[model samples]
Target: TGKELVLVLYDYQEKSPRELTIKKGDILTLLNSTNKDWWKVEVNDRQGFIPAAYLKKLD
Candidate 1:
């Protein structure tokens, strides 16, 4: 569970079963901020993983 506190900085292609296709400026949620690898987020209501380096948590 997270909030309107994450932003996708990179555009991704949906070519994997565990990836959520996202683009720059797309609003996402930070399900976890502990790991710097692939993290959890909700993209267009679909729960998937985006690049950890590409997501910025809002302050």
Candidate 2:
């Protein structure tokens, strides 16, 4: 099993850059982080890819 973490979308460079708003208690899975690609995340039951540059690891 993998650990879980909650994060918000800091920025999306591919499309119109916008701040992602994530509410408290929002559950997220901490997918494997690779050097080639960014962090893959799932939110709102929707799984997609997110660049590590735009993600802030929550303490």
lDDT of each: 0.77, 0.52
Task: Output the TM-score of candidate 2.
Answer: 0.49
lDDT of 1 by residue, 1-59 (tens): 35657888888776689878888997777776677788778876778887888888776
Model 1 TM-score, 2 decimals: 0.76
Q: Which residue pairs come into collision in candidate 2?
A: none
Give the Cα error of residue 55 in candidate 2, in Å.
Answer: 0.8
Worst 10 residues of 1 by lDDT: 1-10
TM-score of each: 0.76, 0.49
Candidates in order: C-alpha RMSD to true structure: 2.1, 5.4
Residue runs of model 2 more than 4 Å from their true location after superposition? 9-27
- CA shift of 23, model 1, Å: 1.4
* Each model's backbone clash number: 0, 0
lDDT of 2 by residue, 11-40 (tens): 343342322233344446656456444666
